Design a protein around this ligand. Structure first.
Ligand SMILES: C/C=C(/C)C(=O)O[C@H]1C(C)=C2[C@H]([C@@H]1OC(=O)CCCCCCC)[C@@](C)(OC(C)=O)C[C@H](OC(=O)CCC)[C@@]1(O)[C@H]2OC(=O)[C@@]1(C)O
Length: 994
């Protein structure tokens, strides 16, 4: 049953043909259950199985590196050698890294909390119904309840489905719908029907929602919807139906993986293509397959040379280290990758109360009527000092303190504020400060009653523990509050019937002290109280009152005003039937205006600043409030979101307004909007959606299942520290202190971690730009094989893997926040940088192979080896350069290799330094600035010797401790990389592409 809330309990019972007394017949149940199904959210999947694994090994790069193993295992099996400790290395070092980055990948012991899971935690397990098969209140399984059957709920119960209350048995029923919105103040329910076919959950006063728990009372009603067909289930589906796109970085690392996987095999073609000589000469000898292994031993080398198997380790390190660094600033980042996107954040959507503000209501100003006459009436305005909840402050008129009670009206003023209040003030002993008890507003009202003290009641000689509510009580003693008509968004007001306590002498029968939003209440006043007398409400007057209410709510002192009025001659206790909600309005007419009070929820002392920061950062911030458009706009000028005098006719919309705008006009409004007031439920999702139709990285603030969809949807959802678990499990970041400022901080932080990430990323892969180049020369022109496949691994996980991580601590460049937000579609490497990293990548390919080519020929090893022909013959079947001797064993010995690798590890250390900036030389960017970089460079070479001296290592690496004479060449062969660098890096001046 869809709009059960708009039907009468009758129309509603009839819709299903059920007796409020008998129940659903066993048939109807099975029958109904076949039609609607089980009152349960659909189940999910995702646990320990073969899936996680196989998908783990589905990635390209992890495959190309697995294929190298599916070949190295056999390649390092046919290889001739008495060694059995260096053979099963390659097929293991890889097969190890593959399985290593598969555990820390299938690691779901931490990151495994889904938002839809908690959603099932809000739906109870059992519920009580009334079928026709048993006259007893059978407590069946919740899962078996069905639209149509009449259920029972009583205190403490968790509502099993969406029911349409039929009959309330208790005095009054109160449920805790916080689960949905968050304002943990339980609400009264009624049986009267909400006729508006499209009321919003908050206004469906005659309905219980599944997930909600009953605060007070006990009622019986007829279930309207179960399963996904419910407010909770509906929210579930929206989330189920939303799929977040992959983050920008993760999107590049894939683009790379693809363009790479192609270029890798693209070079395997050049090999079998450059072989134009091997097609003829090669005769008998069985080398058909014995010589073809050369085409395989180059793949499991060319491949591992272009795959930075150390990146998915560094980026995670730098990231995990940022998570903590941000946690220190109160920003808890759940999703890791997010630290990247949080930097491309272009729009911040924040709620006002308790994020942009403190949620510290306090009454500042208030007034009553002074004199009414000749259509020209005046007023008496006061101000109140004290922004705390502590009854510590004074009431002053004309900047000077006055005795609130010397003023007849200010009395009744204070009277209403106390008897028309469902709250109290409490001094917390332990802590040592008065705290609110309930609605933060009404408390501010209570605190006013104290500060005021219209009856002069002694309070100096009292205890902070019993003085907090002294004056209020005094007033509760002169009037007996019988019953009270709760607030409603229709009448925007809320009265409270009172009776004259026997212990009095001023009893004008009964009274009704009304208090609500100025407009409504004031419009229902036929009179105005001028002191003690009463006089007809006249236009001029109403004109004057509304006048001052308009100034306080839109002025420079953003105030929330409440009209205070009363009914002098209230309807007879008999003529009133409390159960009739919508009827309350009438019971509150023929009123008498008494006064107004304007309170303030101060914007947080640090927000005014951050809003500015977001300006310099080019980040657009959108405040979402509950204030009325008019005051929203003020608070906005106030906190900086708008100029002190900017045009905002079209930049701020109310929810109603935004609804009267057709799709085109709505979207077109989200790209300029900065303030939304009284926005409707869906709207958060709507807005997010629109902001995105502009490729905008949007941050959304919220809490409660209510806002789960939007948090999921938005690029960066932001739950509050005090928020629901679901709202937290749905967001990407949780604000430890629910403060706006900490969102901006975290944005900047996450904006630095990329600037540094972008470095070690274009560095750790810049070396791979060479390793392949090297391998191409070391395979194209001759086979002076300088870089072993099982040797490059250690050079990518430590040799350069250490300076990378060290690069994850580079000094944050100034003005970080004085530039517009990055572009999720900005490639790390391209343009002048493409050509830059091009040379530096080929040059390191002329350096590595050269340590073995430039060597033989000018070295102190080989008097007649210079200008050799390692290109012509390699198999060595005869002797031309050397007749009878033992020289055809140099093609496989630690001599030309142990020289290249060293140079490699030398040019990289200079390239790491070339990776501290992108324009400023090392002269302006002292390579000793990043203290943690040097601390790694040293631990880099400190391990280079360890695999060159300590025998157990230098052997398995095919290297040997180079003489300090021949090791002096590693300098003038590597060291000059910085020149080419510094050249291209100093040439970015004429090329104003940076
Ligand atoms: C891994 C190692 C190597 C050496 C490789 O071939 O990487 C290429 C490649 C895949 C790209 C290129 C490299 O291009 C070549 O080497 C082309 C052949 C040159 C022959 C010249 C003979 C005189 C990157 C490396 O290099 C330079 C130096 O410009 C930059 C960049 O990479 C990134 O931005 C990735 C970061 C996530 C990518 O253009 C990228 O392709 C993309 O889609 C990107 C966006 O990925």
């Amino acid at each position: 049953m869809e709009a059960a809330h708009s039907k009468s309990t009758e129309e509603c019972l009839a819709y299903f043909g059920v007796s409020e007394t008998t129940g659903l017949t066993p048939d109807q149940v099975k029958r109904h259950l076949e039609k609607y199904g089980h009152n349960e959210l659909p189940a999910e999947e995702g646990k320990s199985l073969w899936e996680l694994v196989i998908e783990q090994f589905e990635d390209l790069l992890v495959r190309i590196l697995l294929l190298a193993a599916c070949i190295s295992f056999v390649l390092a099996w046919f290889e001739e050698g008495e060694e059995t400790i260096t053979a099963f290395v390659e097929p293991f070092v890889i097969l190890l890294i593959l399985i290593a980055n598969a555990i820390v990948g299938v690691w779901q012991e931490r990151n495994a909390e889904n938002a839809i899971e908690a959603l099932k935690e809000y739906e109870p397990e059992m519920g009580k119904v009334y079928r026709a098969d048993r006259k007893s209140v059978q407590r069946i399984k919740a899962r078996d309840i069905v639209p149509g059957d009449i259920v029972e709920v009583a205190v403490g119960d968790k509502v099993p489905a969406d029911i349409r209350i039929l009959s309330i048995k208790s005095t009054t029923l109160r449920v805790d719908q916080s689960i949905l919105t968050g304002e943990s103040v339980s609400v009264i329910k009624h049986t009267e029907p909400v006729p508006d076919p499209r009321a919003v959950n908050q206004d469906k006063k005659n309905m219980l929602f599944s997930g909600t728990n009953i605060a007070a009372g006990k009622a019986l009603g007829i279930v309207a919807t179960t399963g996904v067909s419910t407010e909770i289930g509906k929210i579930r589906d929206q989330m189920a139906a939303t799929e977040q796109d992959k983050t920008p970085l993760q999107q590049k690392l894939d683009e790379f993986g693809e363009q790479l996987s192609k270029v890798i095999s693209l070079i395997c073609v050049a090999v079998w293509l450059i072989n134009i000589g091997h097609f003829n000469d090669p005769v008998h000898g069985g080398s058909w397959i014995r010589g073809a292994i050369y085409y395989f031993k180059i793949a499991v080398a060319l491949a591992v040379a272009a795959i930075p198997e150390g990146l998915p380790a560094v980026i995670t390190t730098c990231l995990a280290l940022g998570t903590r660094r941000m946690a220190k600033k109160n920003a808890i980042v759940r999703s890791l990758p997010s630290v990247e996107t949080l930097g491309c954040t272009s729009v911040i959507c924040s709620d006002k109360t308790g994020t942009l503000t403190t949620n510290q209501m306090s009454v500042c100003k208030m007034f009553i009527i002074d004199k009414v006459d000749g259509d020209f009436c005046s007023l008496n305005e006061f101000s109140i000092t004290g922004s705390t909840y502590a009854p510590e402050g004074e009431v002053l008129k004309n900047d000077k303190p006055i005795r609130s009670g010397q003023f007849d009206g200010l009395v009744e003023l204070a009277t209403i504020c106390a008897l028309c209040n469902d709250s109290s003030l409490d001094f917390n002993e332990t802590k040592g400060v008065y705290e609110k008890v309930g609605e933060a507003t009404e408390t501010a009202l209570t605190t006013l009653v104290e500060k005021m003290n219209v009856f002069n009641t002694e309070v100096r000689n009292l205890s902070k523990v019993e003085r907090a509510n002294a004056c209020n009580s005094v007033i509760r003693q002169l009037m007996k509050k019988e019953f009270t008509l709760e607030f409603s968004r229709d009448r925007k007001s809320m009265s409270v019937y009172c009776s004259p306590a026997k212990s009095s002498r001023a009893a004008v029968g009964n009274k009704m002290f009304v208090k609500g939003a100025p407009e409504g209440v004031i419009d229902r006043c036929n009179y105005v109280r001028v002191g003690t007398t009463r006089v007809p409400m006249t236009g001029p007057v109403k004109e004057k009152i509304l006048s001052v209410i308009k100034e306080w709510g839109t002025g420079r002192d953003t105030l929330r005003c409440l009209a205070l009025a009363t009914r002098d001659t209230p309807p007879k206790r008999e003529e009133m039937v409390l159960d009739d909600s919508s009827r309350f309005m009438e019971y509150e007419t023929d009123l008498t205006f008494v006064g107004v009070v304007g309170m303030l929820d101060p914007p947080r002392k640090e927000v005014m600043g951050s809003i500015q920061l977001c300006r310099d950062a080019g980040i657009r911030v959108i405040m979402i409030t509950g204030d009325n458009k008019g005051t929203a706009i003020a608070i906005c000028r106030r906190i900086g979101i708008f100029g002190e005098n900017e045009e905002v006719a079209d930049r701020a919309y109310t929810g109603r307004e935004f609804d009267d705008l057709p799709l085109a006009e709505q979207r077109e409004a989200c790209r300029r909007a900065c303030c939304f007031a009284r926005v409707e439920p869906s709207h958060k999702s709507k807005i997010v959606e629109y902001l995105q139709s502009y490729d905008e990285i949007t941050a959304m603030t919220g809490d409660g299942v209510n806002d789960a969809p939007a948090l999921k949807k938005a690029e960066i959802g932001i739950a509050m520290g005090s928020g629901t678990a679901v709202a937290k499990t749905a967001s990407e970041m949780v604000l430890a202190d629910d403060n706006f400022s900490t969102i901006v901080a975290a944005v900047e932080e996450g904006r630095a971690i990329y600037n540094n990430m972008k470095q070690f990323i274009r560095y750790l892969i810049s070396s791979n730009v060479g390793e392949v180049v090297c391998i191409f020369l070391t395979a194209a022109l001759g086979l002076p094989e300088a870089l072993i496949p099982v040797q490059l691994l250690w050079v990518n996980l430590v040799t350069d893997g250490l300076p990378a991580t060290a690069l994850g601590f580079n000094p944050p460049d100034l003005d970080i926040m004085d530039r517009p937000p990055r572009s999720p579609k900005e490639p790390l490497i391209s343009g002048w940088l493409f050509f830059r990293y091009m040379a530096i990548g080929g040059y390191v390919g002329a350096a590595t192979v050269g340590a073995a080519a430039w060597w033989f020929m000018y070295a102190e090893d080989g008097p007649g080896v210079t200008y050799h022909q390692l290109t012509h013959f390699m198999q060595c079947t005869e002797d031309h350069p050397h007749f009878e001797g033992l020289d055809c064993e140099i093609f496989e010995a630690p001599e030309p290799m142990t020289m290249a690798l060293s140079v490699l590890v030398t040019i990289e250390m200079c390239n790491a330094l070339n990776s501290l900036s992108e324009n400023q030389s090392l002269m302006r960017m002292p390579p000793w600035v990043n203290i943690w970089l040097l601390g790694s460079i040293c631990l880099s070479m400190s391990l280079h010797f360890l695999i060159l001296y300590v025998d157990p290592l230098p052997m398995i690496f095919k290297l040997k401790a180079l003489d300090l004479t021949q090791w002096l060449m590693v300098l003038k062969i590597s060291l000059p990389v910085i020149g080419l660098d510094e050249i291209l890096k100093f040439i970015a001046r004429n090329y104003l592409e940076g």
